Design an enzyme around this catalytic site. Structure first.
Site, PDB file in Angstrom:
ATOM      1  N   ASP B  29       0.827  -1.181   0.000  1.00 42.69           N
ATOM      2  CA  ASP B  29       0.000   0.000   0.000  1.00 42.69           C
ATOM      3  C   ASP B  29       0.878   1.254   0.000  1.00 42.69           C
ATOM      4  OD1 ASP B  29      -1.890   2.183   1.327  1.00 42.69           O
ATOM      5  OD2 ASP B  29      -3.081   0.535   0.548  1.00 42.69           O
ATOM      6  N   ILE B  30       0.461   2.249  -0.757  1.00 43.40           N
ATOM      7  CA  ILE B  30       1.189   3.493  -0.818  1.00 43.40           C
ATOM      8  C   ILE B  30       1.153   4.299   0.464  1.00 43.40           C
ATOM      9  CG2 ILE B  30      -0.658   4.909  -1.786  1.00 43.40           C
ATOM     10  CD1 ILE B  30       1.650   6.069  -3.667  1.00 43.40           C
ATOM     11  N   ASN B  85     -12.948  -3.026   3.365  1.00 44.61           N
ATOM     12  CA  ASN B  85     -13.810  -1.868   3.629  1.00 44.61           C
ATOM     13  C   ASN B  85     -14.912  -1.774   2.605  1.00 44.61           C
ATOM     14  OD1 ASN B  85     -12.100  -1.090   5.707  1.00 44.61           O
ATOM     15  ND2 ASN B  85     -10.979   0.393   4.422  1.00 44.61           N
ATOM     16  N   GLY B  91     -15.150   3.243   5.295  1.00 47.64           N
ATOM     17  CA  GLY B  91     -13.907   3.917   4.935  1.00 47.64           C
ATOM     18  C   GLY B  91     -13.277   3.439   3.637  1.00 47.64           C
ATOM     19  N   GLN B  92     -14.084   2.895   2.731  1.00 47.90           N
ATOM     20  CA  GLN B  92     -13.559   2.379   1.468  1.00 47.90           C
ATOM     21  C   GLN B  92     -12.984   3.513   0.648  1.00 47.90           C
ATOM     22  OE1 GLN B  92     -16.360   0.112  -0.936  1.00 47.90           O
ATOM     23  NE2 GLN B  92     -14.789  -0.355  -2.456  1.00 47.90           N
ATOM     24  N   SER B  93     -11.690   3.444   0.351  1.00 48.73           N
ATOM     25  CA  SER B  93     -11.025   4.555  -0.306  1.00 48.73           C
ATOM     26  C   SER B  93     -11.034   4.491  -1.817  1.00 48.73           C
ATOM     27  CB  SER B  93      -9.599   4.639   0.189  1.00 48.73           C
ATOM     28  OG  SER B  93      -8.880   3.443  -0.097  1.00 48.73           O
ATOM     29  N   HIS B  98     -10.703  -4.604  -2.443  1.00 43.99           N
ATOM     30  CA  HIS B  98      -9.341  -4.887  -2.033  1.00 43.99           C
ATOM     31  C   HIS B  98      -9.335  -5.483  -0.633  1.00 43.99           C
ATOM     32  CE1 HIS B  98     -10.273  -0.578  -1.329  1.00 43.99           C
ATOM     33  NE2 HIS B  98      -9.469  -0.598  -0.275  1.00 43.99           N
ATOM     34  N   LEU B  99      -8.469  -6.472  -0.443  1.00 43.49           N
ATOM     35  CA  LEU B  99      -8.229  -7.073   0.849  1.00 43.49           C
ATOM     36  C   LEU B  99      -6.902  -6.522   1.381  1.00 43.49           C
ATOM     37  CD1 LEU B  99      -8.976  -9.332   2.907  1.00 43.49           C
ATOM     38  CD2 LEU B  99      -7.359 -10.772   1.649  1.00 43.49           C
TER      39      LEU B  99
END
Ligand SMILES: Nc1ncnc2c1ncn2[C@@H]1O[C@H](CO)[C@@H](O)[C@H]1O
Lengths: 115, 112
Positions: B29-30, B85, B91-93, B98-99
């Site tokens: 993750d960034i 999420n 809070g799904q960005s 994605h897991l």
């Protein structure tokens, strides 16, 4: 025995009561007794798997089923604004019962980081 | 699809890739929130878990098995937390399933 003698195995066999949301041949969804959100439930396999780190490759469909059941239950429970699914592994993950479980939390804004 | 995760899958923008197969991609993750923090995503564009189809069931499980294997490869022997999420309360960005897998420190309760 089947399900093991963790508390979750006992719940599966109706030996300890629980507030059940959904049940099929592969899994069980029930409310958490120590909720961390206004809605907080667990989805567990009926097959005993102690923790996700020891899941077998052939457990893929079952693990995916936990997620599909989790999202269906969340919809049935009216979590239209969203929710967070969590699988805790081991000590750093905060796992307390060694029978794998997917937790679903919603009914409030969830924050970042996720613990 | 039409998100930054689609661009990452298509190799249009870079990410530190951990694992790939024909149906998923795992990458760091960034914006890491733990000493190890990576994502496992399907190549199929499922926007959110709430719209996943029954036929996607084994694909979703595959993300989890790949996540487990990557965690072990990355040395997370003391444990980790997997997170999906959904929506604004979740809070799904990014609207591409994605897991997230986080470890390398004690994860706390509640999980946000
Ligand atoms: N008898 C029980 N019924 C429902 N949830 C439980 C029970 N025992 C432990 N839990 C929950 O399981 C989760 C992880 O084991 C925790 O959130 C905890 O509250």
């Amino acid at each position: 025995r089947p399900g093991g003698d963790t508390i979750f195995g006992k719940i599966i066999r109706k030996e300890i009561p629980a507030k059940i949301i959904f049940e099929d041949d592969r899994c069980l969804a029930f409310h958490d007794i120590s909720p961390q959100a206004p809605t907080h439930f667990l989805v567990i396999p009926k097959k005993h798997i102690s923790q996700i780190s020891v899941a077998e490759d052939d457990d893929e469909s079952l693990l995916g089923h936990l997620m599909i059941v989790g999202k269906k239950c969340a919809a049935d429970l009216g979590l239209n604004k969203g929710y967070r699914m969590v699988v805790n592994e081991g000590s750093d993950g905060g796992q307390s019962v060694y029978h794998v479980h997917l937790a679903v939390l919603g009914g409030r804004q969830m924050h970042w980081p996720p613990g």
